[PDB]
Amino acid sequence: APPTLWSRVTKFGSGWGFWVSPTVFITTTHVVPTGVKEFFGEPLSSIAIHQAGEFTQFRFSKKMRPDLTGMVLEEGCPEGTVCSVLIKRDSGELLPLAVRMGAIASMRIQGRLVHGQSGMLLGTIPGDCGAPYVHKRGNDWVVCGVHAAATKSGNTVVCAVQAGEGETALE
Amino acid sequence: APPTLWSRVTKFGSGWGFWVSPTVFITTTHVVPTGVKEFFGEPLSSIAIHQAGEFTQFRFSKKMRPDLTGMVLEEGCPEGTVCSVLIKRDSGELLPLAVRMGAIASMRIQGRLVHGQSGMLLGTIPGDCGAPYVHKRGNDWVVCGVHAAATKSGNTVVCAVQAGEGETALE
Ligand SMILES: [Cl-]
Ligand SMILES: [Cl-]
Ligand SMILES: [Mg+2]
Ligand SMILES: [Mg+2]
């Protein structure tokens, strides 16, 4: 993952977010700060907030990261796809974790129903929630989810994915 | 998978079941015939029926398959384990399907909450529900689930697993 791709990973609330484009920001729902009246200096009313389960997407009415190109955001990825979780730590440390993705489905995790995709790490911490799952397609990168959960032990993680009905996912 | 292992796969209700031992039979809950007053000629009262979600286990008070040895039944298997789904078709055809197992979790599938493990086929049909997921450990085979679901397209399947709390599963 190149420097510019990492610059998209942003500290947000109790976790992190990812700039898909100059105006689009995605993150995990449970890290989004409520009680606030604005995000990155933009009033809530000037933002289109779409939240589906643990997947949250913000569309600002103003270019927040005009330096970035738009990049492709898909709903999860095919079974077996080896992604990379672009985890940033508060210290600044980068911890890219390779993971082979599994099935997409709605899973009951810690009481809440999470629509995402699990995967097997090839460790994560609570504060990592929001980190983007990415993978390379040709010479460009694609983001397909945001870190939403991990098992206590073992090597299982889950990235929440955007809403969407498909035949490849467990409905 | 040897002949004796396949002889454990038994037609049951709208699907199939698996003889773990002379007295233990496991199958998928939604294939179990209700309204009946007995199973394999044994009155319901003489059977200990344990059903947890889509996982059902029968313990008969009498040896039904005294020809079989007991074999190991575990709750799912480690991420990445390549299992084999011992699918039998009504015609008699054997269709062993290789699948690399994924995460264990409670998934909302077709309205119902299924506690199982998904996997990627390396196709199944409704009537296959109940087929055992098995894998070889040393010189012996181990069963760790029963077919409970499959995606419309793609290569995703799910085997229901017995109840049990663990740190490697998404709780
Ligand atoms: Cl950066
Ligand atoms: Cl047989
Ligand atoms: Mg997986
Ligand atoms: Mg899988």
Q: What angle do CA B28, A105, A169 make, to 5 degrees?
A: 90
Q: Are B100 and B40 in contact (CB under 8 A)?
A: no
- Alpha-carbon span B166 to B171, nearest angstrom: 8
Give residue ranges of B with CB < 8 Å to any A CB.
Answer: 78-80, 100, 102-110, 113, 118-120, 149, 151-156, 158, 167-171
* B91 Cα to the center of ligand 2, angstroms: 12
Q: Which two tokens stand for residue A157?
A: 């993680």
The kind and range of the H/E element at B13 are none
Catalytic positions of A, written as ranges: 30, 54, 129
Residue ranges in chain B assigned as alpha helix (H):
3-6
Using only C-alpha atoms, chain B has a radius of gyration, in whole angstroms, of 15
- Alpha-carbon span B143 to B84, nearest angstrom: 10
Question: A120 burial class (0-12, 13-18, 19+ CB within 10 angstroms)?
Answer: buried
Q: Are B118 and B155 in contact (CB under 8 A)?
A: no
User: Which residues, including other chains, have CB under 8 Å from residue B147's CB and lie 6 or more apart?
Assistant: B15, B16, B28, B85, B87, B124, B128, B129, B130, B131, B132, B133, B157, B158, B159, B160
Q: Which two tokens stand for residue A123?
A: 């460790």
Among B133, B105, B170, B155, CA closest to B28: B133
* B97 Cα to the center of ligand 1, angstroms: 45
**Method for structure elucidation:** X-ray
The residue written with tokens 């990445």 in the block is B80
- Alpha-carbon span B25 to B139, nearest angstrom: 22
Give contacts of B104 with chain A, Cβ < 8 Å. Answer: 156
Q: What angle do CA A20, A43, A146 make, to 5 degrees?
A: 30
Among B136, B11, B147, B3, CA closest to B68: B3
Q: Are B134 and B83 in contact (CB under 8 A)?
A: yes
Among B160, B168, B165, B166, CA closest to B53: B160
Catalytic residue among B77, B83, B129, B144: B129
Annotation marks residue B135 as catalytic: no
Q: Which two tokens stand for residue A117?
A: 């995709």
- Alpha-carbon span A109 to A41, nearest angstrom: 33
Residue B97: CB atoms within 10 Å: 20
- Alpha-carbon span B132 to B28, nearest angstrom: 9
CA dihedral A161, A162, A166, A169 (to 10 degrees): 20
Q: Are B145 and B118 in contact (CB under 8 A)?
A: no
Q: Is B95 helix (H, G, I), strand (E, B) or coil?
A: strand
Residue A167: CB atoms within 10 Å: 10
Residue B94: CB atoms within 10 Å: 12
User: Which residues, including other chains, have CB under 8 Å from residue B18's CB and lie 6 or more apart?
Assistant: B8, B9, B10, B25, B26, B27, B86, B130, B131, B132, B143, B146
H, E, C per residue of chain A: CCHHHHCCEEEECCEEEEECCCCEEEEEHHHCCCCCCEECCEEHHHEEEEEECCEEEEEECCCCCCCCCCCEECCCCCCCCEEEEEEECCCCCEEEEEEEEEEEEEEEECCEEEEEEEEEECCCCHHHCCCEEEEEECCEEEEEEEEEEECCCCCEEEEECCCCCCCCCCC
* A37 Cα to the center of ligand 3, angstroms: 38
Q: Is B127 helix (H, G, I), strand (E, B) or coil?
A: helix
Give contacts of B154 with chain A, Cβ < 8 Å. Answer: 78-79, 167-169
Type of residue at B17: G
The dihedral region occupied by A41, where left means phi > 0, alpha psi between -120 and 50, and beta the remainder, is left
Question: B127 burial class (0-12, 13-18, 19+ CB within 10 angstroms)?
Answer: middle
Q: How far is CA B48 from CA B9, B12, B26, B29, B162, in A?
A: 20, 17, 12, 14, 15
- Alpha-carbon span B114 to A167, nearest angstrom: 18
Q: Which two tokens stand for residue A135?
A: 């993978």
Residue B42: strand pairing partners:
B39
- Alpha-carbon span A84 to A97, nearest angstrom: 5
Question: Which residue ranges form the domains of chain B, and what is each CATH number?
Answer: 1-70 (2.40.10.10), 71-171 (2.40.10.10)
